[PDB]
Design an enzyme around this catalytic site. Structure first.
Site, PDB file in Angstrom:
ATOM      1  N   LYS B  13       0.796  -1.227   0.000  1.00  0.00           N
ATOM      2  CA  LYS B  13       0.000   0.000   0.000  1.00  0.00           C
ATOM      3  C   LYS B  13       0.831   1.281   0.000  1.00  0.00           C
ATOM      4  CE  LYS B  13      -3.677  -2.521   0.118  1.00  0.00           C
ATOM      5  NZ  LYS B  13      -4.790  -2.513  -0.875  1.00  0.00           N
ATOM      6  N   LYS B  73       1.174   5.101  -4.949  1.00  0.00           N
ATOM      7  CA  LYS B  73       1.746   3.797  -5.293  1.00  0.00           C
ATOM      8  C   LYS B  73       2.449   3.855  -6.643  1.00  0.00           C
ATOM      9  CE  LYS B  73      -2.117   1.721  -2.899  1.00  0.00           C
ATOM     10  NZ  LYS B  73      -3.527   1.290  -3.086  1.00  0.00           N
ATOM     11  N   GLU B 164      -6.381  -2.274 -10.326  1.00  0.00           N
ATOM     12  CA  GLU B 164      -7.456  -2.194 -11.311  1.00  0.00           C
ATOM     13  C   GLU B 164      -8.088  -0.827 -11.102  1.00  0.00           C
ATOM     14  OE1 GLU B 164     -10.335  -5.292 -10.849  1.00  0.00           O
ATOM     15  OE2 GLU B 164      -9.343  -6.656 -12.263  1.00  0.00           O
TER      16      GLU B 164
HETATM   17  C1  LIG Z   1      -6.510  -7.637 -10.670  1.00  0.00           C
HETATM   18  C2  LIG Z   1      -6.385  -7.015  -9.296  1.00  0.00           C
HETATM   19  C3  LIG Z   1      -6.749  -5.655  -9.094  1.00  0.00           C
HETATM   20  C4  LIG Z   1      -6.507  -5.010  -7.803  1.00  0.00           C
HETATM   21  N1  LIG Z   1      -6.615  -3.659  -7.551  1.00  0.00           N
HETATM   22  C5  LIG Z   1      -6.138  -2.931  -6.558  1.00  0.00           C
HETATM   23  C6  LIG Z   1      -6.172  -1.459  -6.409  1.00  0.00           C
HETATM   24  O1  LIG Z   1      -6.624  -0.837  -7.372  1.00  0.00           O
HETATM   25  N2  LIG Z   1      -5.715  -0.909  -5.238  1.00  0.00           N
HETATM   26  C7  LIG Z   1      -5.191  -1.653  -4.091  1.00  0.00           C
HETATM   27  O2  LIG Z   1      -4.811  -1.106  -3.129  1.00  0.00           O
HETATM   28  N3  LIG Z   1      -5.187  -3.043  -4.246  1.00  0.00           N
HETATM   29  C8  LIG Z   1      -5.627  -3.657  -5.350  1.00  0.00           C
HETATM   30  N4  LIG Z   1      -5.726  -5.105  -5.426  1.00  0.00           N
HETATM   31  C9  LIG Z   1      -5.210  -5.838  -4.148  1.00  0.00           C
HETATM   32  C10 LIG Z   1      -6.245  -6.765  -3.519  1.00  0.00           C
HETATM   33  O3  LIG Z   1      -7.190  -5.999  -2.692  1.00  0.00           O
HETATM   34  C11 LIG Z   1      -5.450  -8.013  -2.933  1.00  0.00           C
HETATM   35  O4  LIG Z   1      -4.825  -8.848  -3.998  1.00  0.00           O
HETATM   36  C12 LIG Z   1      -6.395  -8.936  -2.160  1.00  0.00           C
HETATM   37  O5  LIG Z   1      -7.008  -8.178  -1.023  1.00  0.00           O
HETATM   38  C13 LIG Z   1      -5.621 -10.020  -1.368  1.00  0.00           C
HETATM   39  O6  LIG Z   1      -4.479  -9.506  -0.632  1.00  0.00           O
HETATM   40  P1  LIG Z   1      -2.955  -9.802  -0.988  1.00  0.00           P
HETATM   41  O7  LIG Z   1      -2.614  -9.383  -2.415  1.00  0.00           O
HETATM   42  O8  LIG Z   1      -2.167  -8.991  -0.010  1.00  0.00           O
HETATM   43  O9  LIG Z   1      -2.641 -11.303  -0.816  1.00  0.00           O
HETATM   44  C14 LIG Z   1      -6.016  -5.841  -6.619  1.00  0.00           C
HETATM   45  C15 LIG Z   1      -5.770  -7.257  -6.891  1.00  0.00           C
HETATM   46  C16 LIG Z   1      -5.885  -7.830  -8.176  1.00  0.00           C
HETATM   47  C17 LIG Z   1      -5.464  -9.276  -8.265  1.00  0.00           C
HETATM   48  O1  LIG Z   2      -8.763  -4.720  -4.380  1.00  0.00           O
HETATM   49  C1  LIG Z   2      -8.982  -3.353  -4.304  1.00  0.00           C
HETATM   50  O2  LIG Z   2      -8.708  -2.746  -3.261  1.00  0.00           O
HETATM   51  C2  LIG Z   2      -9.512  -2.631  -5.465  1.00  0.00           C
HETATM   52  C3  LIG Z   2      -9.853  -3.367  -6.712  1.00  0.00           C
HETATM   53  C4  LIG Z   2     -10.329  -2.692  -7.783  1.00  0.00           C
HETATM   54  C5  LIG Z   2     -10.484  -1.217  -7.690  1.00  0.00           C
HETATM   55  N1  LIG Z   2     -10.177  -0.594  -6.588  1.00  0.00           N
HETATM   56  C6  LIG Z   2      -9.688  -1.283  -5.431  1.00  0.00           C
END
Ligand SMILES: Cc1cc2nc3c(=O)[nH]c(=O)nc-3n(C[C@H](O)[C@H](O)[C@H](O)COP(=O)(O)O)c2cc1C
Ligand SMILES: O=C(O)c1cccnc1
Ligand SMILES: Cc1cc2nc3c(=O)[nH]c(=O)nc-3n(C[C@H](O)[C@H](O)[C@H](O)COP(=O)(O)O)c2cc1C
Ligand SMILES: O=C(O)c1cccnc1
Lengths: 216, 216
Positions: B13, B73, B164
């Site tokens: 984060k 980020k 995303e």
């Molecule tokens: C395709 C995809 C899009 C995601 N988008 C974001 C995002 O826009 N911002 C963010 O802080 N985390 C984002 N995440 C993180 C997820 O919230 C995270 O993968 C999920 O909570 C599980 O936690 P971990 O990756 O720490 O194992 C995304 C994950 C994936 C796989």
């Molecule tokens: O996993 C997230 O926190 C997330 C996924 C798509 C868009 N915004 C946040």
């Protein structure tokens, strides 16, 4: 090292039916499936892990006919994983996810939990009501899981091959997935290749980075 | 131990902008992008790797509106990768792939090459001409690449976060991707987390296997 793994792994075309995963490896592949990341930690998936001969035979039914030549891969491999995506993201699932995160202690306050649930619901609604691609969105998370999985099993020293060459309609019916709210996307046999695996000795091929990659 | 890697990686984060990837690591992440598998080795993708302040600023333009929470980020990470998918599958791309496989030495005869080309065209046409889902099909391969990438970078000892939450129209326009035949899908900042990364110390959370996994 992981780069060696990425450069040496390959799509297995034939498996040695006698070589089974150890109980440890069998547990490890399930861990890989479970811990893959996903958008909003939505985990819009279900996995069918076939390890018995009868179980693999059921999965192989999806290759009967036009994809008949993919049957042996599904039968000879030690374990065969069917990656499935939810057909719809319901609120019950959304609550299931946030409640699990809460149970795991990811929220310091009820407001933090509410904010997390609100954000997840916001994007789930956007995909469903405005982008009209919720099914594709969830399927995308499943493919990401598959990518994680292929590298993971390769790093465990196991052979595998991702398969799109199967009839999802047949596979779905075989396991009654539609009524359960799921649909099969990719089948991945895992195990050890045999001498019949012609792809095990061929050089790997990828487009040059000058075509696919821009540095800024 | 790839299982330890999968269990210990997390979505970062906050990044420490002073902690850059080493020169070798910078090349290694590019190798991972390049060597990910894909259906029929279609490699329907393009990557933008931003490592300069100007480059990352261009990508960060996409962290607008509801996505401002992701601007830091994209700006603070050492390297930022933009995963793009082709907007349509064309024969020129198909010829490019088979000719590359030929150059790499995967075909012993002209018949073998022609058979490989026919097979690839068969499924490309199935998606482009029958199912009319080639855009989704190609995007799925990109997400598989992303999954492979996240585990790979974690195995290199690097932090990352898949995103995303960005405006793809803004990003596409900034890099003129549409005219080039691509569209941005996922942004992945890569580097080292800072002490401000609250997610580096929180427990990981996933649904239990008794809900997501069936053994047969
Ligand atoms: C395709 C995809 C899009 C995601 N988008 C974001 C995002 O826009 N911002 C963010 O802080 N985390 C984002 N995440 C993180 C997820 O919230 C995270 O993968 C999920 O909570 C599980 O936690 P971990 O990756 O720490 O194992 C995304 C994950 C994936 C796989
Ligand atoms: O996993 C997230 O926190 C997330 C996924 C798509 C868009 N915004 C946040
Ligand atoms: C989602 C997906 C579906 C695929 N389907 C099949 C298949 O049905 N049959 C097969 O033999 N290989 C299948 N492949 C393997 C590819 O042809 C392969 O990943 C590609 O040629 C690159 O070779 P590599 O995996 O050895 O690095 C598929 C790959 C992916 C990623
Ligand atoms: O990559 C392949 O060989 C392939 C992909 C989809 C369906 N059949 C074959």
């Amino acid at each position: 090292d992981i780069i060696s793994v990425a450069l040496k792994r390959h799509s297995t075309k034939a498996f040695d039916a006698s070589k089974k995963l150890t109980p440890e490896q069998a547990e490890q592949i399930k861990t890989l499936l479970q811990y893959s990341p996903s958008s909003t930690n939505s985990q819009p998936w279900h996995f069918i892990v076939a390890s018995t001969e009868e179980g693999k035979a059921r999965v192989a039914k999806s290759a009967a006919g036009n994809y008949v030549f993919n049957e042996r891969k599904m039968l000879d491999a030690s374990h065969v994983v069917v990656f499935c995506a939810k057909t719809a993201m319901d609120d019950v699932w959304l609550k299931l996810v946030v409640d699990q995160e809460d149970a795991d202690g990811r929220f310091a306050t009820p407001e933090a939990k509410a904010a997390n649930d609100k954000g997840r619901k916001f994007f789930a609604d956007m995909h469903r009501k405005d982008l009209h691609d919720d099914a594709e969105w969830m399927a995308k998370q499943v493919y990401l899981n598959v990518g994680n999985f292929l590298l993971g099993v390769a790093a465990l020293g196991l052979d595998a091959v991702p398969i799109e060459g199967f009839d999802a309609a047949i596979l779905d019916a075989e396991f009654g997935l539609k009524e359960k709210g799921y649909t099969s996307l990719v089948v991945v046999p895992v195990g050890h290749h045999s001498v019949e695996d012609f792809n095990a000795t061929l050089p790997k091929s990828r487009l040059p980075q000058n075509i696919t990659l821009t540095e800024v």
